[PDB]
Amino acid sequence: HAFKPGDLVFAKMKGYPHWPARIDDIADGAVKPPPNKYPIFFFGTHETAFLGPKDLFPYDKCKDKYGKPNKRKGFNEGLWEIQNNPHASYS
């Protein structure tokens, strides 16, 4: 299935563990992603970046592997958000 806004994922960025995140809507940002990349909202840190599917892991499938608490700044806060209110603004 293609990724849609509101999908919950773990998203992999260089130098960071697989991070709790959500697919945001492309209309929410002025700059559009390249083809086959998506706007990714990272929980805890609340940053947004463009990532492609090779770096996106569906949350329900991979939470047992990637949802372990750690000491990285904002990570455990992000785990709380994806579990308790993934669709909140946080703005």
Describe the protein in words.
This protein is α+β, with helices and mostly antiparallel strands. The chain has a single domain (1-91), classed as SH3 type barrels (Roll). It contains two helices and five strands. The chain has a five-stranded antiparallel sheet with strand order 4-3-2-1-5. Strand 1 and strand 2 form a beta hairpin. It starts with 7 loop residues before the first strand and ends in a 7-residue tail after the last helix.
The percentage helix is 10-25%
Content-based structural category: alpha+beta
Strand content: 15-25%
By DSSP, the count of extended strands is 5
Instruction: Tell me the domain tally.
Output: 1
Question: Which sheet architecture does the biggest sheet show?
Answer: 5 strands, antiparallel
**How many DSSP helices?**
2
CATH fold-level label: SH3 type barrels
Rough shape? Answer: globular
Rounded to the nearest angstrom, the radius of gyration is 12 Å
Query: What is the strand arrangement across the widest sheet?
Result: 4-3-2-1-5
Name the helix and strand elements from N-terminus to C-terminus, one letter apiece: EEEEEHH
PDB class: signaling protein
Keywords: Hepatoma-derived growth factor-related protein 2, signaling protein
Assembly: monomeric
Entry title: Crystal structure of HDGFRP2 PWWP domain in complex with Varenicline
